[PDB]
Amino acid sequence: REVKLLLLGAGESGKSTIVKQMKIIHEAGYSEEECKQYKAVVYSNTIQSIIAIIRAMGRLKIDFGDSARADDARQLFVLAGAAEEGFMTAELAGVIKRLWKDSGVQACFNRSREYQLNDSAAYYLNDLDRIAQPNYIPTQQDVLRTRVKTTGIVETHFTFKDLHFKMFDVGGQRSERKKWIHCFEGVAAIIFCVALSDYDLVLAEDEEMNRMHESMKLFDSICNNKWFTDTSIILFLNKKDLFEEKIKKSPLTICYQEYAGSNTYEEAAAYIQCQFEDLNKRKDTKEIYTHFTCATDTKNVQFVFDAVTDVIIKNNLKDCGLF
């Protein structure tokens, strides 16, 4: 009835992005007042994050595209106090919206690698309209996107098809991987995110290494893990939308030298999927449920997730001795 899900994958694979969606798609998670407790923290983080960018601007000698934005910046600090107290007025909201859209602010944000920026900056700022709404009640991810300090493991609760799901999510980067073992306990199914678009990118930890090759290493370990023999295994080729366009621009041989297919979404995407599914040492006794997803797309994620749920209900239910 429950179903603990665990999101695994290398860094920047969009694991948390999935959590963003579940909050909206699913409701009635017996958590209304609890989310209200975190409303003040969400707003507080939004203000500090945009101020983090603006802070970097001065450091980098970046001016707002529109001179008027400077006035919006001055006001931001005055009104910011209200957001910190759990209230976001129409004035405070609009000010943050204009700064976020400005060409100069976006110039800094884009070079966020240069300075420390709030992880949830692009989450609340892009979704600013929704959280600024009257009587805003945070959802599962909205809470998870609070507190600059590391909370630990991103947890999420939502009911779907009369199943109380506890979805969990942990950093992908090499450093965070250690924590994964904590989550290994009580896991019904695993969704392993892989960045399709990362085929020509390299690890932040090591420019020399390929992000997607890294992802293959992790998937090999989870799928063939004795502990996860009984746990359902789901592959989530994420960032399909990014991959569809990117493949046209860049060749796939960057990742897979042996690949001799065309630079098309269907062939290249289908080729990755093949590399990962092959890792399954036990093709005969172990199944992988693969779907192409776009974490930012609420619709697409809902549809794929529905299919995943059916797999859990039919598979996870009773222990199996044979096969």
Side-chain angles (χ1 to χ4, degrees), residues 6-11 15 152-153 169-185 205 214 218 221-222 225 228:
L6 182 64
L7 293 160
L8 303 178
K15 300 188 295 301
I153 302 168
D169 182 32
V170 298
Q173 58 175 338
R174 289 186 184 177
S175 67
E176 297 296 339
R177 296 185 191 156
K178 299 184 186 71
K179 295 157 70 183
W180 289 21
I181 54 85
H182 298 301
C183 301
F184 282 22
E185 184 67 24
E205 299 89 358
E214 187 74 21
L218 286 90
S221 75
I222 304 302
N225 192 344
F228 292 124

Side-chain angles (χ1 to χ4, degrees), residues 26 76 84 87 106 127 164 212 230 295 298:
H26 300 101
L76 181 68
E84 299 183 353
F87 306 94
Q106 290 294 298
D127 216 336
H164 181 201
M212 185 181 290
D230 301 324
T298 307

